[PDB]
């Protein structure tokens, strides 16, 4: 069939600008790598180590510490430290886990805001107060007072996130698989896995921007997702 009829099959690396270069730290191996890092947040950071200031009152002179050397710590190294697993905050792989977790939450939130607005007729912002005063789902009143649900939400999400943090392999922290991939859609190292992962970051980045739209529109217009849509149509 070929084609080259209704489209220009130009050859190049799809980047966030029609012509630009990938940053040295952004190779293109990761899914969704578009060479987008103008601030260089994922650039391998360089730090200087200052020596311990002298604070011994038994000494005549207590000089402050000076640069004891320049070191570039290795990022993307997970350890057994529960509170700070990664070696460096500014690592590409840690940020990708942040990008995926922020993105997956936004995907659920973007769908959740729409569905409850179309089911209950209440704005997602006004939904929080309504459930606080009267715990309810789909119009059915829940059999639990809000105080218990508050503790349960913190305890359930506390356990859930503590389970998540147990994983040490950086790639498996972003893609646990196993029980979370029962259909084995992207558990192998195929091209389909890469393409599926590329779809996930795109939907994730879309949802992050989209939910940022919900909150700003709610701040400005005062309406929810579906409500803001109706307001815009009437605005004409």
């Amino acid at each position: 069939r070929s084609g080259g009829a209704g489209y220009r099959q130009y050859s190049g690396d799809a980047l966030w600008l029609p012509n630009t270069e990938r940053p040295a730290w952004l190779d293109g191996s990761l899914p969704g790598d578009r060479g987008f890092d103008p601030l260089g947040l994922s650039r391998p950071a360089e730090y200087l180590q200052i020596d311990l200031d002298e604070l011994d009152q038994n000494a005549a002179v207590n000089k402050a510490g000076g640069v004891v050397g320049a070191f570039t710590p290795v990022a993307d190294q997970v350890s057994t430290d529960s509170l700070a697993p990664y070696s460096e905050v500014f690592g590409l792989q840690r940020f990708r886990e942040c990008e995926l977790i922020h993105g997956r939450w936004a995907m659920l939130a973007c769908l959740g805001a729409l569905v409850q607005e179309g089911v209950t007729g209440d704005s997602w912002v006004a939904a929080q107060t309504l459930v606080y005063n009267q715990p309810q789902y789909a119009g059915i009143d829940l059999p639990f007072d809000i105080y218990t649900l508050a503790v349960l939400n913190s305890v359930l999400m506390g356990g859930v996130e503590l389970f998540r943090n147990s994983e040490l392999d950086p790639e498996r922290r972003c893609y646990p698989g196993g029980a979370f991939d029962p259909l084995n859609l992207a558990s192998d190292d195929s091209e389909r896995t890469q393409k599926l992962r590329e779809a996930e970051i795109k939907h994730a980045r879309l949802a992050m921007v989209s939910f940022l739209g919900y909150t700003v529109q709610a701040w400005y217009t005062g309406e929810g997702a579906l409500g803001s849509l109706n307001k815009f149509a009437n605005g004409f």
Binding site: R1, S2, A5
Partner: protein, 222 residues
């Protein structure tokens, strides 16, 4: 442009993979449109080609024919009374006065329906018979589909170079006629107005007076 491998095609840029092999550009208007594949058999293709050209020439006459009375009477002789809107023109032979050409009683003034029936059957029968036979008293040029031997008095086709381009011009004007003739039929049934009246409605309110204005006038009410 209209012959050979680089000829113009129906799907334009996307027609590269829609050209049926047997369609090579050796016949007029071979844009290569045979998605269903009826012209796979060369004999069937030969027959279909003749049918298409015959339909086009009949349609070309039909188009001009279906508009000349109404256009004239709308601004001109105005003799055609209610028999100017083609679809509603057949009963002209059922007028007490008669089917008077140009609304002129002296002209034709036919009144017998069976008469015109038998006459046309005899006139058309012999002509169609000669066309099927492939031979007649008139010059036949040897080509049944293209008997310019006598049917070309002006000799507008004396060199093959013109005939080719002229053949393409014939079919393409004919195809537009066939397409527009199908338009007259449907517009007649859906609207019940003359072709110019439908044109007038579109000009007055193009958005309001379109095909979708009468979309619900065929709804299958319970």
């Amino acid at each position: 442009e209209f012959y050979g491998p680089d000829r113009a095609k129906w799907l334009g840029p996307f027609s590269e993979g829609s050209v049926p092999s047997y369609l090579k550009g050796e016949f007029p208007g071979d844009y290569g449109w045979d998605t269903a594949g009826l012209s796979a058999d060369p004999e069937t293709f030969a027959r279909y080609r003749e049918i298409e050209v015959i339909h086009a020439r009949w349609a070309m006459l039909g188009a001009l024919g279906c508009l000349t009375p109404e256009l004239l009477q709308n601004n001109g002789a105005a003799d055609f009374g209610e028999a100017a809107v083609w679809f509603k023109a057949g009963a002209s032979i059922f007028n007490e006065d008669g089917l008077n050409y140009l609304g002129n009683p002296s002209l034709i003034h036919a009144q017998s329906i069976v008469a015109v029936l038998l006459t046309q059957l005899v006139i058309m029968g012999a002509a169609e018979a000669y066309r099927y036979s492939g031979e007649g008293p008139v010059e036949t040029s040897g080509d049944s589909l293209y008997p310019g031997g006598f049917f070309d008095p002006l000799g507008l086709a004396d060199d093959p170079d013109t005939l080719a381009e002229l053949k393409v011009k014939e079919i393409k004007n004919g195809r537009l006629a066939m397409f527009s003739m199908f338009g007259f039929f449907v517009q007649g049934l859906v609207t019940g107005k003359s072709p110019l009246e439908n044109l007038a409605d579109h000009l007055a309110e193009p958005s309001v007076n379109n095909g979708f204005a009468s979309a619900t006038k065929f709804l299958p009410l319970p």
